[PDB]
Subunit: 331 residues, 3 copies
């Protein structure tokens, strides 16, 4: 089976970095082509009862700020087995249990700069899509409770260049119109800024869908990092979204924030970020949507790593607003 | 739906750069594999009259002078909408209206070193296939007149690294056995050789296909560029082709040339290129062709840009002749 | 048609390089995803009797020690023609006749570090998968005898950076349960270590499949190299595998070795490698296999090239053992 998500966002950005030429370079109108094509299949082996599953998914073919061209396997690409009793196991490149909740619902619409890869903690707060991963997905026990658990090699280890690794777990419980979400991830042996780090990240959240057309989500996220020289860091964060759906339309407000980072008990000032976002979406077909989106990113003002050099954050390139229209079509 | 052009040229080149070791490296037999796989489709949205269209086309999988392997999205890759009243609008990565006519008919057979990316003018005479583009293609009004128009982001703007942009327009009129072609492209905020450039390129052409088996194309291209320091540059060029088609055979002579560049009113000597090409093509199948081809490229002898450094042209590597056989098949 | 091999090997390696941090870096658990997607087809041209053939095969989507993503055209990618009287001719990226026998059977299971790309001779003992190649595959004359022959450009020449080339031939003869194999490859104008090299490799080998469930292979490989400064080098090598297949199971022991390199008649001590490997395989489906594998790599201890610099070998990263399980599925 060939599948695909055809997705195209025309997005205008207006940057306020403090440098006008940089604002000219980063800002302006671009096309964010997140179209991808993938291949997947099942096969029932004659001599093995768990059903074989597999997927090979290409990357974004032309994202904004990037060149054309994606290879096959850049996104979720795996093999596995699935049973009605124990759910499914996947080996390969997949989303960590924590990141899947960070990405959805908590990064939509355009909150990712702050809540996905945003933040200021050292080490690696969590992986997102990670290769060299084994991931178990429980079935939805009693149609209300499921578990996601995974471990895998780190980024450096996947190149034979390190021994970083990570493990994570997430749970979901359905309670009436609500879903409750909790997740953990632990990153070990993370090499950065001349230190070896350990990261621990905890997430709790809630999601609601109501028959009057309101739906919403709220998430709290707590990140701790410990470096080998004794330094401890802490940063937490939140994301929330409110939606109203009526006929063929969805109205959505979203907000997400990282709070000031605390190093060794001391709060580093102006190390917070937040983003406010408004979106109108049109259900143009059961297989497609049209959307318009406007958002505002106010980033942190800078921070040094443990090597006395500037640590990179999603605010390094400066504050910016964004206006966009987009289409996404699934097949 | 999956489509493809299976394209294979076995090409022998004999260079004459003036350095025998460089002739040895650059010359010799190679296999130019321009085979490409693509994906496309349409979708009539329930709630939108213009039909949704999309395409994702992979690159040349193993061209000569390049390593193996191509990603999806390297060639024309877009979304868009179409309607019989107002035509087609495409967003993503497409051919500029000007470049399309430069490429076909005027670059065939093997005239592209001179007429396509050949030239000496500064800035960017035109884009060829460009991401971050919106392109309107009109219906063929009265089955005779159509309009291609496009604006897009520049090469550097595509990476958040600059603020270049461009706009282009082309028109075609069918008149008996003739087609009349005209095209403009203007490139802006082009950063090169220490300056910011504006380019203006104009093209006029004719094509004819006659019942006696003769067909032909002839084009004139006018390139002007102006630099931020006041320097003005001008270069013009021609391409022409003559075909005789009898039964399953087509014989073809092509010729193209860039004439001497003029900078601030003064002609720069020996800045011209020309190419003379001969080809025989066999219609081996309604879906495929075989061909043999020989061509002479005599390039310019060098020029400097406005940074007092050598400006790269397609002649930088030296003159060369080329004899080749090829196969193209379409599905 | 779309076809694929879905291949996943979870491999744990334990290195003994003599550097504990390198051992931690190179070793540990990885996922080796060699899943690959391809496209192939034939076409009967209306005006040409030999059937047109073509294939475009993608790379490994996520191999161990490598990043995710592969393009189309990274594995066997070609056009060609086939007729019954004379076999098939392919043009493009294919395996050389010598390499095809090195790889299968003589590299399985996991012998490749030693027998495939392993070794210490200078220049280029042979290509493996090579672009810019023309390869003829004879039919099986008298239902017992076939021939493979090929000529191609070199690694450098396919980028326009040299004039290396190569040619190769192989022959197979069926003798009851046996197949006899022989092959030759010659490489020319190989530029390495300040010299230009000529390589000559010869291979003889036997495969047998007996109805008792016993099968085996045994190969002897002889490698000669001549540098432009007069230096001669010689190294030979061996690969053997023993298999017992009963029911849905295949047991396998393999062994391969490169022996000490001789330079100008003098044996260079400790320039040998060998590998011993055991494997159990389960025919889980007519389309798929599960396997478990353990192997031990004992690599050479270093040598200099003719430029007084260390010559890279598959032992440069140091000795290692490896334990793994895998699935391969074909569609
Ligand atoms: C002697 C310099 C140019 C020689 C070749 C000119 C060919 C132009 O004719 C093409 C017209 O159609
Ligand atoms: C190169 C000589 C190898 C031949 C020895 C084996 C003979 C096997 O014959 C099979 C009977 O049919
Ligand atoms: C024609 C069959 C060749 C048999 C392979 C011989 C095994 C190599 O041993 C060489 C050891 O040195
Ligand atoms: C029917 C008896 C099979 C004979 C065994 C094969 C001989 C193996 O060596 C032959 C190649 O050397
Ligand atoms: Mg990662
Ligand atoms: Mg461009
Ligand atoms: Mg090679
Ligand atoms: Na810009
Ligand atoms: Na892009
Ligand atoms: Na799950
Ligand atoms: Na060459
Ligand atoms: Na190539
Ligand atoms: Na048009
Ligand atoms: Na060890
Ligand atoms: Na490691
Ligand atoms: Na990998
Ligand atoms: Na063969
Ligand atoms: Na020894
Ligand atoms: Na060793």
């Amino acid at each position: 089976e060939v599948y695909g998500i055809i997705a195209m966002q025309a997005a205008y950005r207006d940057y306020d970095s403090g440098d006008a030429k940089q604002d000219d370079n980063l800002g302006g109108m671009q096309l964010n082509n997140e179209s991808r094509i993938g291949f997947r299949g099942k096969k029932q082996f004659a001599n093995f009862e768990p059903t074989f599953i597999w997927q090979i998914e290409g990357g974004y073919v032309d994202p904004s700020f990037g060149g054309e061209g994606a290879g096959l396997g850049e996104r979720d690409t795996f093999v596995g087995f699935e049973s009605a009793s124990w759910g499914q196991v996947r080996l390969g490149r997949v989303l960590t249990p924590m990141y899947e909740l960070v990405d959805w619902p908590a990064s939509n619409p355009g909150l990712g700069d702050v809540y996905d890869w945003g933040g200021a903690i050292g080490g690696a707060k969590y992986q997102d899509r990670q290769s060299n991963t084994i991931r178990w997905d429980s079935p939805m026990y009693a149609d209300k409770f499921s578990i996601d658990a995974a471990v895998g090699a780190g980024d450096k280890a996947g190149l034979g260049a390190g021994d970083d690794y990570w493990g994570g777990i997430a749970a979901h419980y359905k309670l009436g119109p609500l879903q409750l979400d909790a997740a953990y991830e632990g990153n070990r042996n993370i090499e950065a800024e001349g230190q070896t780090w350990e990261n621990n990240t905890y997430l709790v959240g809630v999601q609601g869908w109501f028959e009057n057309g309101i739906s919403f989500f709220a998430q709290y996220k707590y990140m701790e990092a410990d470096a080998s020289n004794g330094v401890n860091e802490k940063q937490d964060a939140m994301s929330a979204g409110l939606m109203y759906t009526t006929g063929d339309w969805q109205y959505k407000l979203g907000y997400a924030a990282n709070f000031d980072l605390e190093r060794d008990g001391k709060t580093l000032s102006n190390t917070s970020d937040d983003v406010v976002s408004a979106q109108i979406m049109y259900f143009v077909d059961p297989s497609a949507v049209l959307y318009a989106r406007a958002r505002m990113n106010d980033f942190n003002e800078g921070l040094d790593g443990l090597d006395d050099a500037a640590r990179w954050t999603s605010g390094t390139n400066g504050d910016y607003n964004e206006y966009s229209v987009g289409v996404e079509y699934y097949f």
